[PDB]
Structure formats: structure tokens, C-alpha cells
Design a binder for these strands. Structure first.
Ligand SMILES: CCN1C[C@H](C)n2c(c(O)c3c(=O)n(Cc4ccc(F)c(Cl)c4)nc(C(=O)NC)c32)C1=O
Ligand SMILES: CCN1C[C@H](C)n2c(c(O)c3c(=O)n(Cc4ccc(F)c(Cl)c4)nc(C(=O)NC)c32)C1=O
Ligand SMILES: [Zn+2]
Ligand SMILES: [Zn+2]
Lengths: 269, 214, 49, 269, 213, 49, 49, 49
DNA sequence: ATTGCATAAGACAACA
DNA sequence: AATGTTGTCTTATGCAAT
DNA sequence: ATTGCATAAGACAACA
DNA sequence: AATGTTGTCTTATGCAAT
């Protein structure tokens, strides 16, 4: 008896359970009468492709500015992270001006080496003409995320939060509740740099600095099961890197490196 | 071995007013040069220098220097003792405590000018470009080659290689026996991929079925 | 392109949009009337009807 | 050797794993040296006491106001839900005037009866002198939540969202994208009423109406185990109601009824 | 209950301008519903039973007079859409409209009582009409009229208070599903169940429970 | 996009459909002749050859 | 009263309030300096040290 | 506040503390004599008799 | 077998 | 134009001892 | 055993 | 003064059939 069910849904927009219970119907007819209505399902499919990352050290870098009140009158800090090894370099400046951005990078360059790409948000001075021409003079790329989401650079922002936490811990563990004397700024920054880079973070067994200088990369990954966009799991690719958050998988013939959500991959056989 | 002995001194640079005092720290086993600059020769500024040098390179085992006012002063002394580094002094200019410091000083003094004429600065670079010049000089001196060998100081210091294999782990076999000779590749959830060290054959194995080797 | 519904800074979800290029995690979207292309995160769009 | 470990934590504030790996130290000493630092553990305990509810029908009621753009020029709606039975009463008005609340409750009384208590936010006219005087004349309690979080009335807020969804579904299934003609307002409202109250929602096998007029309450609950506030499960109480979200338990001797989250209770034996 | 309904449109001057009053009454429970109307229209005709349906439910038949807005195609199409059986009658007949007599009498009595009780004599304030209508509705439906041993609500809904879960069969160790048991609480994977005779409550896995009949 | 067939209420897996943007809840197919874009659930579709 | 940190509309965790009474899911806290009581939900406060 | 035994770095479980204060990952107890409230993690407390 | 433990798996938050 | 991240915390689990 | 199904369990959102 | 809620959806599981 599905004619009254169709009328009931059309004039009333009833859920499948109640329609089944109220017209002596079962699973199927209740379903294919509830999905006929275009109004019974509008949103519930929101794509989420979440994957910024580099492969080897000195390949992809990120950068953002931070306002740290304890660092007055030089509160502004420039933070740079190498996505491959998660090393951090921060330099202190008084203004967000381009010249400060110029100063920060080469100091980081002298410590980590020369990268190839530096992702950053479209800051007022990152895209400045002088910055662009100087960067081209050095000769490495420059890519900007979408203009407005401070979220595609999630790694530098997360390292920013970590650095602010560490510097707060150091500052108020020494007896400076509200800010820092000018005589303590530099050694606080240096100690913060030494703590994160040269020591483990969380549970990984590999120090970031020796990750950067002594990295390991697989030349050929193990077979895995891959949620190709085709709907289900396809068999026949190999994962290169599988981070806790997200992973990269490689084709067996096309030789494509793709950053894919980690839920889209599972081990083969 | 790397990271065993360090060296330090100062150097007045008239080209770099007003912050005309410059500090240089040099490794001995790798000749890695780390420099930081301060206007006045006090304590706090130079311990800031030493902290930065430690951060960029690591914690050494011994530091040799002169008998300067601050170098043996208390603040520095207990700071180093808390850091746990063996101080060493000597004749202010002796060829042992300052064996490589003067060579690094002359190399840096050549480089700073060379770059200043490179960007056309003769008497004193403005205060804006001082840090950029120092960083460029550090990059040139450290990562490049001025000797006649095939190893840059970075190549000497960090032993930079490109590994291919993960740490070795002793896998358990279905009969219940631990078995070494296997190295993990990918630490996927639930299942970890481990490769036979001999046959280069990978296999997916449950997490608890594998334990680290040695 | 097919019509999609995009969120904005207010949190609403407005109509009158079409997708030109479908990136792996990004998308360039295009007004139905004004006919102007902007890019947007793929997590900030849901389809239409 | 934990002397160097203590020095390392004091001067560096290092995580326990790196402390264990950097000084040849094991689980224990790493832990009780990392918890010594007060700065390393500040936040990670935020209590969540989450429990509004009534027991029987016509005991506890909730109310809020809604701005519905399609209902112009009478957009404002007053929504009332019985916490025990989840039945919904709504009325359409033009002003937030206290008289509107007078009318909305009066109709709510006529359809459902006389409750005992009504919980609501401190609306501009909810606590008005005339409103309170008339409520006292009727002789029913009134209890405002914390002044500022529209979250203690979560039941009426969720009912508000659901009602908005249903009314928009009906309206734009009737072919009205932007607004509804003044003629159709009452028909839409009453159709939503009949769809919501008289048909069960989600998966519960009980219609809200016959939940209200035919409530079931357990005179003696089954034995359960209770995460008593001391932090460990205790044996010897009985659960009165265990909703999908949250539950109520009763003592075996003191006969106290309290509302606790479902995580705090697990079945006995 | 929910079988046959009556209705009529009655005048009253005290609620000007919307002086038009709509009525609808059930048979088995004598429940009332009342709606204001600025003017009797076939659209306002629609507005009434829609509200009446929500408060009471969907009846099985409705009987009325031959009113102008009672007989237009809009009402017929609407009632056909809801699948309810119309049956017109004489505007004043007793074999048809039979409970609406008592309905109108009691409604007018209560309206006068309340309107004079709250200090009004000839015109209710426009903001205070719905107040009086709802109060009269509640008084006439939740309180017994005259000799009535039950109010309309008890007859209409049978508002008993059960205290036991539905009959449910439980998986016995022989694998079968013995009926005569009633669930009490639906916990996490465990549902406390009692026997209708021994009155013993036992926790059982949610995979081992299914309803009776 | 590659050709696909969609599920119709009648019982016909009709051809002439190529997915343009495909999500994890449903797809956005377009016809080859009429070239009209519609959104159909992921279990309403089936690829071509 | 013991020292807790409470949120505000900005989203920070300011310090300087002692809690007086503990509801099941609420609390009233007194400032040290402005020595005044305000009622806050339990899920909005965390201590110091 | 019921009496509770608290823990110190010394190696003993000392008495003389009534928990005014309980949290999910701590307690704040107060001594009878010193009448001082201190946030102590829940691991370092146990019931007094 | 029961308790305790060592680990693993999963959840939360906040960065202008 | 060009996409979340992960340290920290919590709970669950299997083993090892008892 | 393999596939599908019937069910249960878990996850997201948004409401001034 | 007085505390999140739950419909909708997706994923996982087990049994029954093949
Ligand atoms: C144009 C110059 N500019 C910035 C605009 C003003 N901005 C800048 C930032 O650094 C941030 C920032 O860090 N976060 C914090 C944040 C919020 C959500 C996340 F997911 C993640 Cl990873 C980070 N937010 C913003 C912002 O605008 N709106 C949230 C923001 C910036 O440098
Ligand atoms: C003073 C008179 N007044 C209200 C203040 C203005 N308010 C009133 C509301 O009805 C709401 C409301 O519904 N929501 C929506 C909402 C947001 C988050 C949730 F968790 C839930 Cl449960 C509900 N928010 C607010 C608000 O204040 N800030 C978001 C609010 C109101 O009536
Ligand atoms: Zn529908
Ligand atoms: Zn610490």
C-alpha cells in the first residue's frame, strides 16, 4: 500500500521509519518513497580533501607571522617550518614590513639550507614587489594559499601554537608573568629553538633535526588498498609516506605522487 | 669525532656601526662557523651568542677561549656549569685555544667585505641589512666549499645521508617465535609493512605481532 | 558547471554558483548571475538539490 | 641518573619521551619528573556537568523565540516543548511583547494542559512584571537558566532548529522559495504541528503524542553501576530513565533522583 | 473516537473586528476547537480543521451544513487530499448537528463568564482575545462538564500511565526466544529485562533481544 | 568525464551521462545531447563499459 | 575559594576567580580584585597550577 | 569535605586534607590547619580511612 | 583466573 | 592560485604476574 | 565460504 | 539562578542465503 505513503510524504514529508510504521510498509518502498522528495536530502555530502605536505627536506616550506605580547617592543615573530622534517626557525622583528620578511628567511636559509618552495598566506608584505624580486634573485618558488583561509598553511599555524606554548612555559617558568625584559628575549628564543628542533615531540622516535639532515625516504612503497574516487577500494598502488594524519600513495604505472586523506588508504592483502 | 671542541673570540668590525662588536664560534672537528653580533661587550649579550650557537649546532663538549673579562666571569661560569660544558682558557692569542678562531675571523672578514662590495656598500651598511648580510655570509661559509675536499662542514657535521630503510624490528611468526632480520617501512594503523632484509620482500603484519629489534 | 551551494563568512549557504575546475581539495566557483570566478576550499561547498 | 633529568626539565621543559630517551631513563622517573613542573600541566581537566531534564509529562517546559524570515510580517514564533514527552507547541506573533508570551503559553495550556515548571532564557519580556504576575496567578513555577548561554535550553533550541527545517521543507516543497503568503501561514504551521507531534521521530518506537498522553515511568529501576563523583564506578543504585543522550538514577536508600550523563552509568553485573 | 465531527460559524460582537467564530466538535469525546476569523472565507475554512487536526488527530468523517465556504471546490479538494469523508446537512438540522448545540451553549456561557470575569463588558482588547479563547478551550476540555465523570481529554486519549515495557522475547540458552518478557531500560549493548511472573530483572546482551509478536 | 549510466525509478539504466564533479554522497552528471546537469545519489549511478 | 580560570566572550582564559558553590553543571566564581560573584557553566572553567 | 590522604614527592601519603574540590584530572584539597587550597592531580589522592 | 600493566587506539584544541 | 595539523590526554586491551 | 542484507553503532550539525 | 540535544547519516557486524 504505497499510494497513501506517496501522498503522505508529498503533503507531509515524513521520515521513512514513521511512513513504514503508519502504512504497513517495509524497508524498500519506504526508502524509495522518501528519496523521491528532493527536499528530504540537501546537504549531507560535503567533500573534505585535506592535504598540504612536501616529500623531501628543503622542498616545501611554510611561514606566518605571530603577535607575542611577551616579546614587546619587538612582539612580531616570523615562523618558518620545513614540512618534510618539521624543523622550526623563528626570528624577531618590530614590524611586519617586507624588510623584516627579507631578514627572517636568509637566517633560516643559513640554518636549514636552500628550499625550493615557500607557501605563505597573502600577507601585505609577502606579495610586496621587493620581496618577489629578491626571492626571484635567490631563485626559489613562491605559492600562496586561497586568499582568506588561514588553514591551508595549517602546519606553520600549528607550529606557531606550539612555539607560543613553549615560549610561554619558558617565560613564566622563570619568573616573568606578563612579559620579558629586553635582556632575556634572545636567549629565550634560542632556548625555544633548541628545545623543539633537537628533541622528540610526542611519540615519534626520530628527532626533527636528524630527520632533516638524515632523512629516510622509501624508493618503492608496499602494496595497499586505495579508496580511489571511484567509490570503493582499488587494488594496485603503493604508499610512499603514511603519516598519522595523512598519507601519500604512488601509482604503479603512471608514477603519480598524490596527497590523499589517510582514511582513503588501507593495507593490501 | 664531530661536536667535541669549540672555539670562540670577538672581532671589532668598524664597517658595522654602531653594533661594531662581533662574536664568532667555530667547531673544530667540522670547522662549522656560527656568528652573532652585539653592540657592547657585556655578559648577557655574549651568553645570548653562545645560546644561539648551541641552538643552531647543538651542545658541544668543551669550549676554549681567552681570559677575557666576561669569558671567565661568574655568570658565564655557572651558566656553562648548568649547561654542563667544560670551559677552557688560555693565553689571549695562543695558537692552541685560538688555533682556528683567527682563520675563521679572516675568512669572515673577507666575506663580509666581498658581499658589501657585491651590493656596493663601502663604509657602513645601514642597520637594516646587517642581519641579512650576516645570514648570507653564514650560508656561504657553512654550506659551500672553501677548502679543497669533497665534504662541506654540514657534510662533515651532521653526517647528512639519505636513508631508505626504517629501524630493524624482530617480527613474530605465526608459530610464536620472534625473528629479527626484518625492518619496518610504514607504520600504518593496525597493520605495519615490514621488509625481509635479505629478499627485499614486504608483507603486511599486525601491529602487536612485531617488536623492535635490539 | 553543476550548481552548488557555498558557505560564506556568515555561515549561511547561498545558491547561484557553478564549479569550473575540480581540484583535489580546492575548487574555483562561479556566480550564476555576476559571472565571476573565485576559488574556495572544497570543505566549504555542498551541492544543490 | 635523574639529576641531569631534573636539570634538563627545569631549564628546557622537555616531554617525558624525549627525557627518557636522552638520559637513559625509564617510564617512572620520566613521569614523576615531568609532572613536577607545574607549567607542563595546567588545562587538561575541564569538567562537563551536562544535565537538564524533567521526569513526567507536564513537569518541566522550555521556551525560546525564533525569527523566521518566511513568516513575514509575523516572523516571530514562540516554541514550547515538554521535556518529558518532546511534544511541541508554537504560535506566530509580530512583537516580542510579553502579551505574545501570554497568548503562546495560553494556547500551549489548552493543547497539552498545565505543567509545573517552565525554564527559559532571561528574555526582555520573559521576566517582565506583568508576565511574572500572570504566571503566579496561573500558579506555575519559572526558572531562568544562566544569564547568557542559550545552551541550558538546549531542548527548545534543538526543537527550534528542527521546526525551522520542517517548515522550510514544507514551504519550498509547496513552491515558495522566499516567503509564504499571509493566507497559508496557519495551514503550514498546523501541518507542521500534525507532522511533528503525531508521528514518531528518528527511531524511537513511540509517537510523541502517545508518549505524552500515555507516559511510561519505572517505579523501580534496574541495578546499575555508577561513576560516583570520586572517580570510580560504584554498585548499588538503580537507573530511572536512560535516554540516548543522558540518564537519571535513583538511590536505593536515600531515593535521590539526579541527572547524570550516560557515560557515568553502566549496567550492573 | 476520531470518527465524526461537526462544525458551525457563529457570531459574537465582543471580539470585533474578527467577530467570526468557528467551531468543531467530536462525538465520542465532545472535544471542542475554536478559531478566530476576521471574515468567513473558504481559505479561513482551511485554516480551522488544520489546527483542529493537530490538537486531536485525523478523524474518520466530518458533517456540516451547506455553507458558502463549506461547499467550494477548495475545501472538497483539501478534504480529498487528506482522505476525509465530507457529509453536508441542513443549516440547523438535529439529526446531523447534534452535539454542536451543547457545544455552542457551553462555549458562549464560558466566553461570557471569562469576559466579565476579567473586567470587560462589551469589547475584549484586540491583544487579549486569544487569551480568552485559549482559557475557555482549556476550561471546557480539561474539566468535566456538569455530571461528566471524565473530562473530554480522558475519553479522547485514555490517558493511563503504564509502567512496563513492551512484551519482548529473549534468547534462551536453547537458542529459542521465549516470550512473556518485557524490556525495562535500553542501555549500551545491554537491556535490563524482567519476567512477567517472577518479577526479576536481568541484564542481557542487545544481540539477544527481540520484541514479541 | 567518463560516460556512466544512472538508476531510474522505472528500471532503466539509461546511458548518456558523464559525471563532472563526483562527491562521496552523490555525483553531478550531465547528459550528452541535452547537456543538463543534475545531482543523483552515488547509488543511482553505474559506469559505462 | 580555590583559583580557577574562566572563559569570556573573546575566548581567552583570564585568571583571578575563586569559586564559591559547585552545581552539578554550574558554578559561581568570585574575583580577587573586583570581589564579585558571577554564575558560569561547569564546561567553561578550568583551574590554575 | 571528607578527609583524604594526599601524596608528596617524598614517598609518603599524608593525611589532614579535606577535598573541597574535585575535578576530572585533579582534586583541590585544603588542610585543616593551613586552610590552604591546592590543586592536586587525582592520582595523588586516596580516601582517608 | 584476577589484577595490574604496557601499549595501542582514539579524542580534543587552537593557531590574528 | 595553491587543499588541517598533532601534541597531549584518555580509554581500551592483552599480557604478565599473581 | 561469498554476497547481500538487516541491524546496530557511531558521527555531524546548528539554533539570534 | 537554573547544567546540550538528536535527527540524520555513515560505518561496521553478523547472519542468512547462495
Ligand atoms: C592577512 C594577514 N593574516 C591574517 C588573517 C587576519 N590571519 C592571519 C593569521 O595568521 C591568522 C591566523 O593565524 N588565524 C588562526 C587560525 C584559525 C583557524 C585555523 F584553522 C588556523 Cl590553522 C589558524 N586566523 C586568521 C584569520 O583571519 N581568521 C580565522 C589569520 C594572518 O597572518
Ligand atoms: C537575550 C535574548 N536571547 C538571546 C541571545 C542573543 N540568544 C537567544 C537565543 O534564542 C539564542 C539562540 O538561540 N542562540 C542559538 C544557539 C547557539 C548555540 C547553542 F548551543 C544553542 Cl543550543 C543555540 N544563540 C544565542 C546567542 O546569544 N548566541 C549564539 C541566543 C535569545 O533568545
Ligand atoms: Zn520529503
Ligand atoms: Zn615542565
Amino acid at each position: 500500500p504505497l499510494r497513501e505513503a506517496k501522498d503522505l510524504h508529498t503533503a507531509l514529508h515524513i521520515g521513512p521509519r514513521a511512513l513504514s510504521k503508519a502504512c504497513n510498509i517495509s524497508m524498500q518502498q519506504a526508502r524509495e518513497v522518501v528519496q523521491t522528495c528532493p527536499h528530504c536530502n540537501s546537504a549531507p555530502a560535503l567533500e573534505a580533501g585535506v592535504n598540504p605536505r612536501g616529500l623531501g627536506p628543503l622542498q616545501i616550506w611554510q611561514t606566518d607571522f605571530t603577535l607575542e605580547p611577551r616579546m614587546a617592543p619587538r612582539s612580531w615573530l616570523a615562523v618558518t617550518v620545513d614540512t618534510a622534517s618539521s624543523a622550526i626557525v623563528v626570528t624577531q622583528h618590530g614590524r611586519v614590513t617586507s624588510v623584516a620578511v627579507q631578514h627572517h628567511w636568509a637566517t633560516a636559509i643559513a640554518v636549514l639550507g636552500r628550499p625550493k618552495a615557500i607557501k605563505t598566506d597573502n600577507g601585505s608584505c609577502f606579495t610586496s614587489k621587493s620581496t618577489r624580486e629578491w626571492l626571484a634573485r635567490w631563485g626559489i618558488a613562491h605559492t600562496t594559499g586561497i586568499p582568506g583561509n588561514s588553514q591551508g598553511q595549517a602546519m606553520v599555524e600549528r607550529a606557531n601554537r606550539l612555539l607560543k606554548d613553549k615560549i610561554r612555559v619558558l617565560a613564566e617558568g622563570d619568573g616573568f608573568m606578563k612579559r620579558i625584559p629586553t635582556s632575556k628575549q634572545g636567549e629565550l628564543l634560542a632556548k625555544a629553538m633548541y628545545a623543539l628542533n633537537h628533541f622528540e615531540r610526542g611519540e615519534n622516535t626520530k628527532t626533527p633535526i636528524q630527520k632533516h639532515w638524515r632523512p629516510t625516504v622509501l624508493t618503492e612503497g608496499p602494496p595497499v588498498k586505495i579508496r580511489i574516487e571511484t567509490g570503493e577500494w582499488e587494488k594496485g598502488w603503493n604508499v610512499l609516506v603514511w603519516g598519522r594524519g595523512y598519507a601519500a600513495v604512488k601509482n604503479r604505472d603512471t608514477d603519480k605522487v598524490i596527497w590523499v586523506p589517510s582514511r582513503k588508504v588501507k593495507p593490501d592483502i | 669525532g664531530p661536536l667535541q671542541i669549540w672555539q670562540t673570540d670577538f672581532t671589532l668590525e668598524p664597517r658595522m656601526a654602531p653594533r661594531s662588536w662581533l662574536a664568532v664560534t667555530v667547531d673544530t672537528a667540522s670547522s662549522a662557523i656560527v656568528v652573532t653580533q652585539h653592540g657592547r661587550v657585556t655578559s648577557v649579550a655574549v651568553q645570548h651568542h653562545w645560546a644561539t650557537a648551541i641552538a643552531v649546532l647543538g651542545r658541544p663538549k668543551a669550549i676554549k677561549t681567552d681570559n677575557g673579562s666576561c669569558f671567565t666571569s661568574k655568570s658565564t661560569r655557572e651558566w656553562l656549569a648548568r649547561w654542563g660544558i667544560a670551559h677552557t682558557t688560555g693565553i689571549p692569542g695562543n695558537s692552541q685555544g685560538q688555533a682556528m678562531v683567527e682563520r675563521a675571523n679572516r675568512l669572515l672578514k673577507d666575506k663580509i667585505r666581498v658581499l658589501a662590495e657585491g651590493d656596493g656598500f663601502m663604509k657602513r651598511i645601514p642597520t637594516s641589512k646587517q642581519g641579512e648580510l650576516l645570514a648570507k655570509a653564514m650560508y656561504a661559509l657553512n654550506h659551500f666549499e672553501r677548502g679543497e675536499n669533497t665534504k662541506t662542514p654540514i657534510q662533515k657535521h651532521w653526517r647528512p645521508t639519505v636513508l631508505t630503510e626504517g629501524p630493524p624490528v624482530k617480527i613474530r611468526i605465526e608459530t610464536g617465535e620472534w625473528e629479527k632480520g626484518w625492518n619496518v617501512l610504514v607504520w600504518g594503523r593496525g597493520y605495519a609493512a615490514v621488509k625481509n632484509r635479505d629478499t627485499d620482500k614486504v608483507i603486511w603484519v599486525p601491529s602487536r605481532k612485531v617488536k623492535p629489534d635490539i | 558547471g553543476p550548481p552548488v551551494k557555498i558557505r560564506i563568512e556568515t555561515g549561511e549557504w547561498e545558491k547561484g554558483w557553478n564549479v569550473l575546475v575540480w581540484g583535489r581539495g580546492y575548487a574555483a566557483v562561479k556566480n550564476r548571475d555576476t559571472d565571476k570566478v573565485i576559488w574556495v576550499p572544497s570543505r566549504k561547498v555542498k551541492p544543490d538539490i
